[PDB]
């Protein structure tokens, strides 16, 4: 699982 895989603009 992993709906939020955007560790850039966070």
PDB file of N, CA and C in Angstrom:
ATOM      1  N   UNK A   1       0.826  -1.200   0.000  1.00  0.00           N
ATOM      2  CA  UNK A   1       0.000   0.000   0.000  1.00  0.00           C
ATOM      3  C   UNK A   1       0.865   1.257   0.000  1.00  0.00           C
ATOM      4  N   UNK A   2       0.274   2.377  -0.405  1.00  0.00           N
ATOM      5  CA  UNK A   2       1.006   3.629  -0.444  1.00  0.00           C
ATOM      6  C   UNK A   2       0.413   4.616  -1.430  1.00  0.00           C
ATOM      7  N   UNK A   3      -0.735   5.206  -1.066  1.00  0.00           N
ATOM      8  CA  UNK A   3      -1.428   6.181  -1.912  1.00  0.00           C
ATOM      9  C   UNK A   3      -0.669   7.500  -2.018  1.00  0.00           C
ATOM     10  N   UNK A   4       0.068   7.839  -0.965  1.00  0.00           N
ATOM     11  CA  UNK A   4       0.831   9.074  -0.962  1.00  0.00           C
ATOM     12  C   UNK A   4       2.322   8.836  -1.101  1.00  0.00           C
ATOM     13  N   UNK A   5       2.777   8.652  -2.335  1.00  0.00           N
ATOM     14  CA  UNK A   5       4.190   8.411  -2.600  1.00  0.00           C
ATOM     15  C   UNK A   5       4.816   9.592  -3.335  1.00  0.00           C
ATOM     16  N   UNK A   6       4.666  10.783  -2.765  1.00  0.00           N
ATOM     17  CA  UNK A   6       5.216  11.992  -3.365  1.00  0.00           C
ATOM     18  C   UNK A   6       5.963  12.828  -2.331  1.00  0.00           C
ATOM     19  N   UNK A   7       7.076  12.295  -1.838  1.00  0.00           N
ATOM     20  CA  UNK A   7       7.880  12.991  -0.841  1.00  0.00           C
ATOM     21  C   UNK A   7       8.778  14.035  -1.498  1.00  0.00           C
ATOM     22  N   UNK A   8       8.157  15.008  -2.159  1.00  0.00           N
ATOM     23  CA  UNK A   8       8.898  16.068  -2.832  1.00  0.00           C
ATOM     24  C   UNK A   8       8.435  17.444  -2.366  1.00  0.00           C
ATOM     25  N   UNK A   9       7.176  17.765  -2.650  1.00  0.00           N
ATOM     26  CA  UNK A   9       6.609  19.050  -2.261  1.00  0.00           C
ATOM     27  C   UNK A   9       5.815  18.931  -0.966  1.00  0.00           C
ATOM     28  N   UNK A  10       6.237  18.015  -0.100  1.00  0.00           N
ATOM     29  CA  UNK A  10       5.566  17.805   1.176  1.00  0.00           C
ATOM     30  C   UNK A  10       6.505  18.082   2.345  1.00  0.00           C
TER      31      UNK A  10
END
